[PDB]
Symmetry: C5
Subunit: 311 residues, 5 copies
Amino acid sequence: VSPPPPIADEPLTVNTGIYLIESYSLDDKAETFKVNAFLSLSWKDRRLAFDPVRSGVRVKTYEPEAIWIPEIRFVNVENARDADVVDISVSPDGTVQYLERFSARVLSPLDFRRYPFDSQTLHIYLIVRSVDTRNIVLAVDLEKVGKNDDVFLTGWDIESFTAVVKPANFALEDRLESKLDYQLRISRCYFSYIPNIILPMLFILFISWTAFWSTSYEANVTLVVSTLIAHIAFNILVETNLPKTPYMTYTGAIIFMIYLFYFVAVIEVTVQHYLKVESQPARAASITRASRIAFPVVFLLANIILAFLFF
Amino acid sequence: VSPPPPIADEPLTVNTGIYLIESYSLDDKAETFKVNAFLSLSWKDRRLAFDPVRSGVRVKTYEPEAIWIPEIRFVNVENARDADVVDISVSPDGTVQYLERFSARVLSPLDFRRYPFDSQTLHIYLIVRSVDTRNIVLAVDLEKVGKNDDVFLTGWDIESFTAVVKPANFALEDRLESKLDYQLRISRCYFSYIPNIILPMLFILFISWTAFWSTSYEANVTLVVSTLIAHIAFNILVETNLPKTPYMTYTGAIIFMIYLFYFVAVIEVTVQHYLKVESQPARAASITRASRIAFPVVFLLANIILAFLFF
Amino acid sequence: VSPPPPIADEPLTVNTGIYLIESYSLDDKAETFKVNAFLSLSWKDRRLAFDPVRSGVRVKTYEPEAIWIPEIRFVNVENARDADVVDISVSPDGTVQYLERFSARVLSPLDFRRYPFDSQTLHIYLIVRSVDTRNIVLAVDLEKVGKNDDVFLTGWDIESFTAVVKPANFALEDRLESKLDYQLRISRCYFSYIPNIILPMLFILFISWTAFWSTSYEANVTLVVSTLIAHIAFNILVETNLPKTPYMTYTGAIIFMIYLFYFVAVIEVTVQHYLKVESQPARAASITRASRIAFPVVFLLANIILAFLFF
Amino acid sequence: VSPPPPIADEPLTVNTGIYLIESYSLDDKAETFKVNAFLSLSWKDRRLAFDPVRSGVRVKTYEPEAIWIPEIRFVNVENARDADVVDISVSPDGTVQYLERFSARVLSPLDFRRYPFDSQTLHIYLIVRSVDTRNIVLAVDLEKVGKNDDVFLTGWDIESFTAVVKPANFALEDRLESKLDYQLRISRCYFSYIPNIILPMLFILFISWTAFWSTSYEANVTLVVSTLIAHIAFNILVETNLPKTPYMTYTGAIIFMIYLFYFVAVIEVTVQHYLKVESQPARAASITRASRIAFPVVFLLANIILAFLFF
Amino acid sequence: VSPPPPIADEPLTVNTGIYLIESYSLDDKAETFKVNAFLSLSWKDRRLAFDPVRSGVRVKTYEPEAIWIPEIRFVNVENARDADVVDISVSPDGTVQYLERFSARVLSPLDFRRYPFDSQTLHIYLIVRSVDTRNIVLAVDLEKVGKNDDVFLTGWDIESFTAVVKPANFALEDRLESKLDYQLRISRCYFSYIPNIILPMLFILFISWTAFWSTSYEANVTLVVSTLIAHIAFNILVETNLPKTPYMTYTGAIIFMIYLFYFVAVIEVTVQHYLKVESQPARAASITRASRIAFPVVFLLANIILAFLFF
Ligand SMILES: [Cl-]
Ligand SMILES: [Cl-]
Ligand SMILES: [Cl-]
Ligand SMILES: [Cl-]
Ligand SMILES: [Cl-]
Ligand SMILES: [Cl-]
Ligand SMILES: [Cl-]
Ligand code: NA
Ligand code: NA
Ligand code: NA
Ligand code: NA
Ligand code: NA
Ligand code: NA
């Protein structure tokens, strides 16, 4: 079997559509997501045309092997899609209507800069390669692009599923390629990060600041060092859920900054003890009283600056 | 091969049934479960009708390729089911009896609000897409819906496996779709959560309250900070067994609330020490004595309020 | 191809045998194990009978497609077995000898009540479904049931591999089903649990009891709280190797009980300090001296009671 | 297709060879390793004899389905090998030369007694079952046994890859079996265990011994209990990399013994404090001074004894 | 089908090219990476030559089964590549142009000596085994070697993808083998290691040095032992992301060295306390004051020495 011949010297237009049935397994570390969807294809093959009267049929059904079908592939997939043909219908003018249901693991880069208050644009790139006989170009049938109402992505909110209607036509290995961009816009469900990571992390930090109302060096060392260790645990927990980035994430910036607060609190606790041993407590008292205001104030201003730089 | 023709203009009814053989791997984080079952299908094909007197045979056995079989699919599966045809039997009137044994990974959302005292309704959605020649509709043969007595789902109690007899008939990509809802009702085995998470978490909290019978600041700081760290460990352990939710779970609410109790206990321990250093121990004594009653009382009332809001 | 016709009115007897080549991956949490074995099948098909003199052969070798073969399945498997036919041999009287080598992941429930001193009976259920033409029944050829001497299951001792010779015949969807039970008896290698979990857990508990020979409240708080935290670590380690059970395991019972010992030790340490602060040390001394005997004695008696209830 | 006929009453000899291309994934806990290799087979089939004059060609190339090929299997594999035929060459006398490239996961037991200074002999067992028409026997073509120079097994040193030339011929399920033993000798790269586990474990133990130069009970309790907790962490880390064994490993013996040293150090610290409180410090001083020598000396002698028993 | 015959006695040249579409899953512990690419092949088959004026067609499209195709394999792959033929084009002179899209898991050793500031050269080895009729040699078509602009490897920077144009021709099991080396040069994104591992590790070490400004033994023991435990946690975290190496890594060297600093700090804290108890504080003061300078100075010089030895 060979591609449909051109009346005149035009490319063969293959109309496409993707209808999402299921969206699952968004892996942050791997920067992948799994998809289960319908892929619809449509093109004109004059060689398959028929007269309805003498045939007695308004439509003709074919097996994929019986007719010419364009070799449509996904660019950003781990392995080739698992596909099963649902229907192949031919109308009198030879207009072919192809429908398959597929499942695929899609590679799509993620921007973690605003994590866990981040939004992403996931991409599904559809592609066709031209043949020596003729050039094959892709188009979007907007009536056949969509998603099931029940489509849910655990830990995320699904905003939209749209297609960039104009294909990216270019040369690859001395043959022309026609590429379409299907976009799935999602926003992260940040809720759980507040009672599980953010507030526990703030509680332990505020607990370390009780050392500014204590003259007991031994108790102060215990307060600041113990809470620091708990902060290390939260830092480790956060970085296990994320890939390594050449940039700072919003959460990563806060976590890093809190180390500086623990480090300066240790210096204060040391300075206070040293002065008291040196029989200079009036002075140590001035530093401790200033610290009671300075630590929460600098923490608030530094957080306003960070939120501003990131959002 | 083509679908059976209508005698007058009626849709083709495909009678269905699912008989569960095995239920395994309920993954909370992934919101999936694996199933091994029998799928039974039945429809009338007059083209296959025969005379039992002349044929001498009461039933005819066919290979799937020899006859027309409806394209039945599962909506909420990761990948297409792994199926093997067991039997195809045709009665003299042309009624076809199809039986296959399949295994599938099913995606079904879970409500964690009442965790670990939660119940779930797992769904298996059966679907058929209508052909151009005629509309295909699904039905439930209640005599072919069930489960093996030995069916067990580790960590859960299986209540029932029933089917919603009325299909959801709708248009999808300019064709009719007939959808059936098979429901597997389960309730979580909460037992082990009591000696492993709930009681150890309560023991460490009550240990922190022994600081209300101690005047030693250094020992009090050690009591409240050490038990807080153990509470952080249990919080981390709990959230690893669960996906991220846009709501609070029952356990998550208790765990979060216990942080406030540790935070206020640190304030009390700090206030007590501060007053004693300021030569005001009579006053510190009043706060400490009140705390001995206030902390268990407020803990009990807050838990009654939470249990009421969640159940 | 169709089943062998009955001479009279008798069911077709299919003689079976399983010879274990490899046993691996016993997953406690999943309640599964992997198996690699030979499956042997034998039945009488008179249509295949031949005269040795006329044919010039004493045995006839066929391909699976050439002859009728019973559809034998495993009940308790995750997915269908990976099988490869080794040989098919027909004797002059039509006695067929079938041999296949297979691999399968088997679901078999485990009783963790006596963990890690538990024994299990793993099951491999062989099944056949009867055809409209005739009833198929399974039998055990004891001469073809066994295991390779080198068969080892890491962390376990293999006791026996036997078959329950009488099948469980029952109706499923108006057809006779014949089920055979192949049993693999195993006992857990508890050795490593002694130096890795049991003795370290006892050492830290005995270390907490040194507080009964100390008047230092601050050192006592450090002794009991630090060892409790180490006990939490061991509790977490143990529950990660096990699924959630609606019952207490032997190890789980000991682990739970040890929390009560830590809790009462904290009360003793608190009571002792309180009395000494109240200028009542003679009294605190009586409680501390009694605790030195009471704690090891109650620990020994409670363990005797537990061992008795579990074994 | 059937096996080659015997001239006179001899078994069919199938010459074998395995050439290792890649060795990877040695899983200690699973006791498996993955292999990618060439499997070469050679046998005489006179029914394939040809005249180069008549056929034109000096060597005939066949497809596996066109000719009789011996059913060669691996004994100790999880699933059947992933194989791809590279060549099937038939010479004029009927000598067949078969070459396939395969990949397989091999189950081979490991002896952890000397871990991490252990060596292993991994096995790949080749097998053939005899047919009714004639007995099949395996042989080793030493010219076709080997490994690529670049073959590396991460964390191990590869010593040799040889074959036991004499097959193990035996009866199994009333037929002959011919088994060959291919051996891959490896030795563990112990280097990294020294700076990562052994020396950090020794440092924390020696830190606990500083308590023998301190009279401060509260500081001593902190020294011995904190380092013990760090030792528990290392014990847990080590046992996660290893399966459960019915014997003690070398590392496991040292780790277990170090607990006794921590336990006796706690007793010493308790005894010292008790005597000082009882106004007997001269006596406490004698025990502490003896401990300074006894602890490192007994540690050295116990380690010499252990190294001797294990190596 | 058989290979193309030689005009004179020249080997058959198969021109190759690899065009990377996707690069993902660089596993450090496994020393593997996944690839999705185009594999292009080109050779001359005179038996396929045709007249362009007579045939009408300028290029002829064949199915893989219709023509002879060289058996091209990858040396360093876990399992055989997942390949799908895109196009086969024959020019009038008989020049065949083969194109397939494949996905493969590649084994390629990694040098961790400079981790996390390391660079790697990943290899993809293409190979062909000669046939009895003629020798097959591989060549690089540089015009068909490349990578998509969007190719990204999470946690790494992709530098170049080039091929060593000269094949490695050698004898293996009495037949010629032609091997090509495709090289993917990458450099690690070290950024995240600085705020997540390096700086937190330095902060805790500097916190341990505050003990040189404290006379309180009990507080000093708490400072040095607590920070040491946090250092153990970071050592464990680092070694989980890496395989076991027969050499020291840069990070591993620093981590190991920091243990010596903690060990000597404990000695200093012990010596200081011992002298003060012995009524020699003027001397303890000299050692403590020297330590304030010695510890940061020796730390800086040791790090300069290490950086010099590794880079
Ligand atoms: Cl694809
Ligand atoms: Cl399906
Ligand atoms: Cl099966
Ligand atoms: Cl019955
Ligand atoms: Cl029946
Ligand atoms: Cl095999
Ligand atoms: Cl390959
Ligand atoms: Na086609
Ligand atoms: Na302390
Ligand atoms: Na069909
Ligand atoms: Na058959
Ligand atoms: Na064959
Ligand atoms: Na070919």
